[PDB]
Symmetry: C3
Subunit: 232 residues, 3 copies
């Protein structure tokens, strides 16, 4: 529900964090707080791997449009910063993170999805940075998140042309790693997480950092300079 938008469930060697705000899983302050608290739970439980899911309608429609279009600049910037901080937290997470993309993933929803080690979606789910289409220049933090995953040509189209990807085109582009039928997206993600929990955790954590260090530093710059994009 809107006031209780995240659930946390431990299943043996994994933890499953599910977003369902009863709508489109907007990544506002309350959702970010709930997600950070759920990841805190995973930290305390020292789980072997993390699964993050959306609901039956979407993975996430991205940042909360209401806060963005409210005329109040500061809450908007804090929300953006918190969202990209969460992305940074997941990208640098010391356990394997598997995303269960259970519906469309748009804008920050797509950026968030792109922070999983392994991403599972169904063929019919749209993944898109629609920012340019609706009149927003893509923040550097979001650009660097996408740049880490998208092929060179997909990165060009996804950004400048707000291109929509799905299924085989998303897989080819690097917006997802695996396609499954809608009814087994979550199950496949859990199965994958259980497998990755069998990897050596220390080598995994060290290796993923080595494979991402440059992007993490650029994302950090994008987070810290976010206000400056808007002249604040």
């Amino acid at each position: 529900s809107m006031s209780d938008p995240v659930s946390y469930t431990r299943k043996d060697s994994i933890a499953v964090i599910s977003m369902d705000d009863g709508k489109v899983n907007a990544l506002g302050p309350a959702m970010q707080q709930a997600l950070n608290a759920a990841i805190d739970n995973a930290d305390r439980d020292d789980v072997g791997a993390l699964v993050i899911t959306g609901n039956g309608r979407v993975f996430s429609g991205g940042f909360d449009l209401k806060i963005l279009t409210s005329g109040e600049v500061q809450p908007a910037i804090d929300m953006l910063r918190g969202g990209f901080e969460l992305a940074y937290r997941l990208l640098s997470y010391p356990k394997p993170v598997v995303m269960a993309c259970t519906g469309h993933a748009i804008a920050m929803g797509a950026f968030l999805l792109s922070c999983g080690d392994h991403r599972v979606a169904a063929h019919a789910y749209n993944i898109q940075a629609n920012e340019v289409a609706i009149g927003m220049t893509i923040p550097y933090a979001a650009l660097e998140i996408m740049k880490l995953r998208l092929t060179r040509s997909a990165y060009q189209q996804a950004t400048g042309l707000a291109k929509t990807f799905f299924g085989e085109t998303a897989l080819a582009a690097g917006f997802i790693d695996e396609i499954a039928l809608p009814e087994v997206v979550v199950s496949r993600a859990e199965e994958a997480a259980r497998e990755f929990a069998g990897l050596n955790q220390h080598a995994h954590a060290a290796t993923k950092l080595r494979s991402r260090a440059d992007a993490l530093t650029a994302i950090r710059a994008g987070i810290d300079g976010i206000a400056a994009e808007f002249g604040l």
Copy 2:
């Protein structure tokens, strides 16, 4: 024709620039001048998007071989510089640029094609940097153009091995973004351009620059140091 190699046609929200020198659309001085004048026209008309096409035989066979093999170094270097300047102009263009690859695109023809935001070709059209095959080391400006679009492994083969791509292999590699039947390549490119004209133009222009800044600077270096590759 050879003396009148470019046409410019405004269609509602787009402008269509067509190369047809009656042969292989060689990118010599007269062609570059005509293309720059056509883009000047688009600038004055402030169109929503640009389509650039070849003729029924090729997109372009690249730089004019006659000028290259004439024994006169300076016209050769000026032609190269002008060609890569045109590439830079298109890559940084503030409106969406759609390439209608209406036949083969070889060497500078392929480099030029790689400057469109969206590239449409038919399955049978060869796209190739044949430089290494014919005894030329690829200029840095051309390397950086390709590096921005080609997957890591395609970039290796396209350069060092002068590999030819087409259709599905070109799409996979990042030498094109869309495949269409020969008879609708131009129509599909126009349709795409009309769509992209509906994107927010300011966000598009800003975002494409952010997504290309490093490549643009490297291409600029390649242009400015072009003479130095040949010890001049």
Copy 3:
């Protein structure tokens, strides 16, 4: 055989170097020495292109596990250094290098494979950096080798998740360039090498260096600092 693990055969414009230690072509000191001596032969014979093959069981199972798990640090580090030096030698080789991946390629076997200009494998052959799975953090030299060839998303999974690729997934990822049936892998590699020998050799050598300079420097750093990864 184990004591005579490499053969060198000149065929017209190419040389064929075949690994067969009677087992899994482990890249220990004796194998590295034999390979370097075979490449020395190719240097003296000034061949048009190089083909490197495995045996009927594998391309290579990577570094010699016995030396790695012997409790003696220095032979282990020398072996690693020599292996990555060989990789560097092949990546910077002035003639086209074609890999005939005649079976699985695991860990350094996969890193070695990734040093060919053109890589041919059969659909059933596994290619995997299994380091994270078995408890090793991937060395920087190996990371940079893979980074030069793998798509952005394949690079993430191949490293942090020790993902196994094969056939179409290897081709898509950039772990190979061509798939052939097992019985013609070597023949196809030879045919390709003969073709590449027809490229202009000077332009090939210059162009491949330009297309790899950054990676070569990073690999060199990884080689020279290899001891430092282990605090030596």
